[PDB]
Amino acid sequence: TGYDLSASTFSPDGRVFQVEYAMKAVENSSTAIGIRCKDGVVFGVEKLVLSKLYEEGSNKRLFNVDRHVGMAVAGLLADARSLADIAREEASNFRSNFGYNIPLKHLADRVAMYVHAYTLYSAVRPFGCSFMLGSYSVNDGAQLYMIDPSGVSYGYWGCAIGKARQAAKTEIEKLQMKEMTCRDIVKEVAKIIYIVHDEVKDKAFELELSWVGELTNGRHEIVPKDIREEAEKYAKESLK
Template sequence: MQPLRPVLAGPEGSKKRLFNVDRHVGMAVAGLLADARSLADIAREEASNFRSNFGYNIPLKHLADRMAMYVYAYTLHSTIRPFGCKFMLGSYSVNDGAQLYVIDPSGVSYSYWGCAIGKARQAAKTEIEKLQMKEMTCCDVAKEVAIIIYIVHDEVKGKAFELELS
């Protein structure tokens, strides 16, 4: 007999953790999903406002700094709670190449070549450090990342596992 799904669990695939922020920016999150959706909406608004004001896509460094300031502002006052999620912003452009920023719930922004967030992040970071990413194509890196996710996944918990690449 299979366990019943809780009624409040929502439909299959409703707990997506990857978001499109702009034409050239994607966002991956770990932590509270409601906070993540709120931050994804703020990031979309920032990118849209930048494009309408300046006429070109927002640079990822600028978006990461704006989002870090926004998240940091929620740590300053005791009347509002801080965001309960950590998120990555990734982008590729012809001029700047591939970029990756991670924003902590404290409002600190870091730039990385490769990083992992969420459960088993330390094991995933160890596997990422073994890769020679500068010598690999994008398709090869995507395949290796999928393999790393499968390696570090904890099968003992028995939770449903869905791999989403974007």
């Protein structure tokens, strides 16, 4: 051994294990999925009720970076909201210097170069978080990006991060996200995260949904209660 202690050393076959070890820490966080509809992006996070003593609305794994940009995280939660602070701060420097709202192909570029910068030195560790960025503009449409702890970003029609990643994105491609608007998506977002996480592992869990598009007039916010109650009404019909 000895070839895997620092992030400054390659292996004798040419790969870095400190990044791969931090990628393994993501699959112990639960599940965060997000797909984009024809005219907007819908996030979705199932939230484990660890004990009864916590309060409904605690420790949200679903942030709010800018007025139109949303973030759903998966990983070590202290590093999640630390990456959320620099992304919230990066968009403020764009509007102050250039005058207008930051686009997603630039925002996820500036954040991923900040994540990549900790995969080079021995003085710092790689982050233990993977997360998704989605938004809607009236001149660019809906956007959906995703960033690993190594620093690689791509566009997606729908993605999934958490424990059951392949077992979640198997059913995403059963949908048709090219033509559905962001109303019937909300019922289909919830349904594919009820079929995952058998009740042997967890007793009870919490649904948390997010929502952006021109139906929300460009601003990012949470779903209302009645709409996610319709999805929770559309929960127990997967037993047939």
